[PDB]
Amino acid sequence: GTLRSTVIADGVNGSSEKEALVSFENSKDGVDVKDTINYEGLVANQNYTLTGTLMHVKADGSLEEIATKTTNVTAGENGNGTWGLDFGNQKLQVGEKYVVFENAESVENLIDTDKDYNLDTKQVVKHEDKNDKAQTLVVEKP
Ligand SMILES: [Ca+2]
Ligand SMILES: [Ca+2]
């Protein structure tokens, strides 16, 4: 299973090649932060707990949690599709970089890990890549 993500910051999307650039003007009333999560290789019609974390990237490369959103979601027809997380309006600061991390954990056991054809382990998929520009926003200087 995989998760991929796109941050949408004041209506500006991240991409693999370019962080979402949020103008200082846009940031003055806070930054509306949403995230769309493309999942593949999950189990069709099964419930997952989806956790998104908006991380502030500090000068030393360490991360601190700004916002967290947890939803209860269901995998599609064929175990693939898109979920969303709306973090709402966030008070993000000029010159700073923020990145969205995502985790999905099946509510039930979905994996047999000991060849007895009984399910014993949850499926866990994560995307925790602070270098993924598609998940990254930067607040620009005035
Ligand atoms: Ca704004
Ligand atoms: Ca088993």
Author numbering: 446 to 587
Give me lines lifted from the publication on this model.
Central to this ability are non‐canonical covalent intramolecular crosslinks between protein side chains forming isopeptide, thioester, and ester bonds that impart remarkable stability enhancement to single adhesin protein domains or are involved directly in covalent adhesion to host cells (Alegre‐Cebollada et al. 2010; Kang et al. 2007; Kang and Baker 2009; Kwon et al. 2014; Lei et al. 2021; Miller et al. 2018; Pointon et al. 2010; Walden et al. 2015). The autocalytic machinery of ester bond crosslinking, as first exemplified in the Clostridium perfringens adhesin Cpe0147, shows three residues (D577/H572/T450) arranged in space to mimic the acid/base/nucleophile catalytic triad of a serine protease, with Q580 the equivalent of a substrate electrophile (Kwon et al. 2014; Schwarz‐Linek and Banfield 2014). Two buried and protonated acids, D480 and E547, act like the oxyanion site of a serine protease, polarizing the carbonyl bond of Q580 side chain to increase its electrophilic potential and reactivity, and potentially stabilizing a high‐energy tetrahedral intermediate. In the proposed mechanism, H572 abstracts a proton from T450 Oγ1, which then effects nucleophilic attack on the Q580 Cδ with the loss of the side chain amino group as ammonia—the final state is the equivalent of the acyl‐intermediate of a serine protease mechanism, but without the potential to hydrolyze it is essentially trapped.
